[model samples]
Target: GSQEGVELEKSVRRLREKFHGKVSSKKAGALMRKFGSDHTGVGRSIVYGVKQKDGQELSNDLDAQDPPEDMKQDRDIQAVATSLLPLTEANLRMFQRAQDDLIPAVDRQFACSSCDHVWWRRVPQRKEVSRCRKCRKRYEPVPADKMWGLAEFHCPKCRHNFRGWAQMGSPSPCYGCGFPVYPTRILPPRWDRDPDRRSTHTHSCSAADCYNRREPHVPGTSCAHPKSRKQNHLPKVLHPSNPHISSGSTVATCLSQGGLLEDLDNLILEDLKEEEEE
Candidate 1:
């Protein structure tokens, strides 16, 4: 509290000295906005400059790079996709998985504070889902990049209807699919002395019919298509310490370092690209 008081006084002194005896129209308008007095005009002017990138200078510097061609193409596709109104199952799953994994994993974890429940639902686009089972309150998904870990649950049990989220180190698997779970350990820690370690937890399906079943769905995992390769058969990266001595590298390093040999079949495929386009 003492430090905060000192900082506040220092900030006020700095502002007063900077603007001493000055009452420019721009400064007056900014003050008006600061105090919540009619900010429409000020807001509009700021928005215009931001949208048009006005008065910005371009430098003749080769180091100022642009996005790679492939990345540029990808961004163009994404822009078009955002402008349109379409929601496919694949896109919905991708959104849900990203939210469930990346947001909580990297930023913050979320749980309903009122009821202490951490469950969340993935609703289909344009479809009205049922109310919360515990509270009978409606919920909506608001997608954004910044993580706001756990959210509050407005449980009916509480007199107040407000809800919030809590921190969750690990969350339960999706009932529909088992993609988000405790990651499997492919190898032990990089070294015995290295203090850093990943989560050692393992996961199994909680579905009533599949309780404790460790295997992926017989048809492959829930989302895995029929032709998906079994986990064991798929290639794995070797640990760094392994001494197989093939080119003095691990599998992951080899893949990144190796150059692909040009083949006649690939050459023919490249040549036939224009024919396919036509």
Candidate 2:
């Protein structure tokens, strides 16, 4: 601890600098280039608009979010990139730390309701598991064990209890019967239970124009949990800033700046000599 301390501090500053300078700005420019779509909303970017599993974009409600000009031009993307800069500051911190509420996770001892078998959840999906961990055909999380999703619910018809998100307080489909159940609680805002970057989306997609939509769109229905994801320390209240940047743009930024977080990992996980040694 003693000898390597100085070297460690120096590297930490360097890491922060790289993150503050090189990595983030590049991502900002890329966001606008990729998502500033004139699609429908005034400023709707792929970033904030919700989408269905089929890949069709839904109305995120808002305009003026897209790049005002052709993204093909570097200057146009740059214009929006500067505005996108504010988010990266907090995005970095949001990514760096595993926010308990940003993506609330299941209780460590969470178990399958059918078999009472314990399993760890790391991915975002309709159910805790495709099949029961012990029975191998069904997976139903016990409602008693709080988890990384919207809220708790009970299917009165099936008398089944489970964990997950619901559509605007509507009864989410039951994991056991696939039938809609009456819901009693509103789960917190979550990316998903997964701790990885993939966790940042809502798997439950809805077609913007489809009448099948169980409920109408809830503006700013974004994560409002007390520990919701923040931008530069500002919590994303009902919705994030009016500037709903494109989700695609945000994903692109992650792909390009993957090293911003990974490098930080290396600095803490292994010393420079060890990193090179491997």
Candidate 3:
């Protein structure tokens, strides 16, 4: 009979001779690593019979298992099996693409000139949370809220105080000496404006003492600085030459150079005026 022990022994001997010592338990781990065995228990199981229970068949898809430890029966495993094999290559490529898209292309470093504090941002241009790393003094990336504001200035040669402002479409002289202060600091050129329609905002006095001494203003009024000017002096259709020497028009430069907008902490110009008058 086909089920005879003597005949089975002879068949096994023939199979063992043909396959040699390759079927050792120690080699199972190596085989799994090489061939990526799909958890099919064909060679490992003692009985070559389908083990079924009084529930739905298990799937071969590993993710379908409600908690791998909970899946005890073969039916639970069969329920998760994929009719079509999973594409490991395609899945890996998709993961690579996602990482490439999300990662920052360049690392940017910034420093506060007032205090030599350093900071970095993943994005090339950032607006919010401009502050001195050492003093924690908040600053604006762009002082002027409007797109065309001339609000970037540096300190005078002898002082560290700085001021900025947006002026009407006219050349402005230095507020202190009445000297012609042309657009040394250029507002980034806009396509809609004329090259001659120049607007200048005083950014800083360069003298901290001078900045502290400026008069305050009333609420909803212009800046307290006696030189405080309107926010928008130029029409939208005017084109002006690039104000600053820098090529790129980004917020990062403003943040680094201590250019911040007004009304930082609900502390309006009126409050400053009142404090000074008191």
Candidate 4:
């Protein structure tokens, strides 16, 4: 009987090593199913070996060979004991150290938006505007809001704004109200063709019932006249031809004056050049 118990202890140790230091309930069950029928004592040996810490050598004492009387009949106790067993001495030591050192000493801290004052608080509850302890000034914790691009158009029918890039192309129905909005482009005035000419082309909705116009129709009324009002003349700064220059200018002057040059600051030009390079 003593020899058989020693052999079973050795078998349990071998199984622990084979599974790489961790034994799950499934693995334990498999072992139990394989050995439980032929060697009834083998399950008790396995439970004893798994329960002992790695540094603790296997005891040959008959009393230590089996689990406590209360736990002796529980299959789950055996399974849990098997899973807790460490395959190597080093693994047991590492687990002990981890358990002892894992706790954090203090809660996390954050700086105030206004004065860089330090405080501790959870994320997501951060204040939009916080007062600084040092400066006594209110400052925003988050960055300022930014728009990607200009709102391209607005729906007169529902006063809804449309910003989709596709809206600039063909006629598209408004999201709020089913009113067709058309896209049109206006050309600059012909300053070189006629010295006295100052007018420029404009673009807008042709719908007479558009809300932006003077006489907006009632809600749900079909567009009585789906005609866009005349777009306001393009500003003089946007004119292709020079308004001050006469029509009899030289060919070189006329060529220079033929192109539109609105808002041509150096910064804007540099940005355009950078975009082109990219």
Candidate 5:
């Protein structure tokens, strides 16, 4: 309180001396309201205002000099503050609001990678799919360069797949064929028939009537198939209850009956056909 009182007097005196009796009492009173009656606040206001009035350039020569560690953080804060929207009473209060209260109300805007259409969506919950609003293409909150880490295993029959980490033994699904791609096993060679002597890592074709199970291939033996006819392998359509598919029925007409997964399957097929022609 004592320091504030002393600073108030100092600001008033500095204003008086700078104007040399030419400054009206009305103009001096306006300065107190603009800069507040504080030493640092009024001092900064007077310095910058006079520099601009005299056509003097405000150089960053002092700022370019090495700053102490304690001052470095302050410099960073000032740098950010300048770029922010002009400080006002409402803006200050908005910044001070609780993040939890603000985040839910604020829409996270993004442009679709496929269609380049701009749209806003609510922030995704953990394990939520980030689907584009316009084209309904699936997206993840990952950078393009880092996407190689998301290794996908697709079924050769219908191309339904799931992605997992690139590291070995990551569990993922061949959703199209309703089969799990065993992480440690490679396809084509197939598995041995002897259950006890078979490789611990295995893959069984879950397609109807296929009954084909695979194990680690023996060094000298041929891994041949027993069945002659292939089962009707359909792309796996996610049920309405599936969490991976957003159940927003209001957006599109096709999603009302077939759901997001079926729509996605059609989109994937179109892309595959395009690739084949190219």
Candidate 6:
């Protein structure tokens, strides 16, 4: 052992002699990696930043680093899992789907948003009555818009204010006031992707200026803003490839190259709007 070239550092023996409290290997290793370079000689040479310098150790390192497998995974998983739960109040009746309970789907409880009423559908089905308890309206009807989108419906009648989730461009029921509110302007379901954070958003279209927290469209189309449309649907001078296109020529040239008739599509949408107008 005396003939061997390798030996513990003087600092190691010096530090070991003084009893500071113990820390886990993973914790110490992570701390060193986060700072870059480890205390033990066995630790890997962690490269960091986009370009880490070779052959020299620097005092500071990159913002990002890898954690040990056991340290990285379950810790994050447990953190996410732990943060996910809501306050569970004792003795509160939580809703559960009825079962071998002998409850039929037809007899299932349903509510009418239009009338702000709740009743079993079978009651209306058996009596041939309107499913709505308040409206006393008939249950026979069909509806469509193909996409369930979001909109802030301000009810003029009941002074109800809420973001409504319903068929896009169609009327939705204001359950708060029981008035049938039309989503004349249905918007994408844009919201803060991280419900816990703010000044940061993820579900955004190209229309960063519209400033409404909107979700994306079902068909994956651009925003509803005319400014956003002209901004995105048509190529412009800002685009380097089409930079040379004259101000007047850009529209036509962009349409021609893209192979999709977005301009005409808007025109046809206007036609659909005309039909919607009574």
lDDT of 5 at 178: 46
List, residue by residue over 1-278, the lDDT tens digit for candidate 5: 23443344444433433322223334445555545743233333333322222322332111122323333334322332243334344333322221111211212223343453322233322222345545656543332222212244665657666532222343334545544453332221112322321122232432232334333312222111122121223111111111135433111111111211223334334434444698
Q: Write the residue-wise lDDT of candidate 4 on 28-145 in tens digits.
A: 4455455642223444444455545334553222124544454455565466456566444544432332223211111122234233233221111212222233443333322111
- Model 1 scores a TM of 0.15
Q: By TM-score, is 5 or 6 better?
A: 6
Name the runs in model 4 displaced over 4 angstroms: 1-68, 94-278
Candidate 2 yields a Cα-based lDDT of 0.33
lDDT of 4 at 95: 33
**61-142 per-residue lDDT for model 6 (tens digits):** 2223453554334342233223322212310111010001111112222334454333322211112222233443334212
lDDT of 1 by residue, 28-136 (tens): 3343434333222222222222222323322111112233333334432234224322333333332232212211111111223243332223222222121223443
Tell me the TM-score of model 4: 0.16
The clash count of every prediction, one per candidate, is 11, 17, 45, 4, 2, 7
lDDT of each: 0.26, 0.33, 0.28, 0.33, 0.32, 0.29
TM-score, per-candidate, Cα-based: 0.15, 0.19, 0.19, 0.16, 0.17, 0.18
RMSD to the hidden true structure, all candidates: 25.2, 20.6, 26.2, 30.1, 23.3, 28.3
> Once superposed on the true structure, which residue ranges of model 6 sit more than 4 Å away at CA?
1-148, 189-278
Candidate 3 accuracy as TM-score: 0.19
Clashing pairs in 5: 191-214, 191-215
User: Candidate 5: where are CA atoms >4 Å away?
Assistant: 1-127, 130-203, 206-233, 239-278
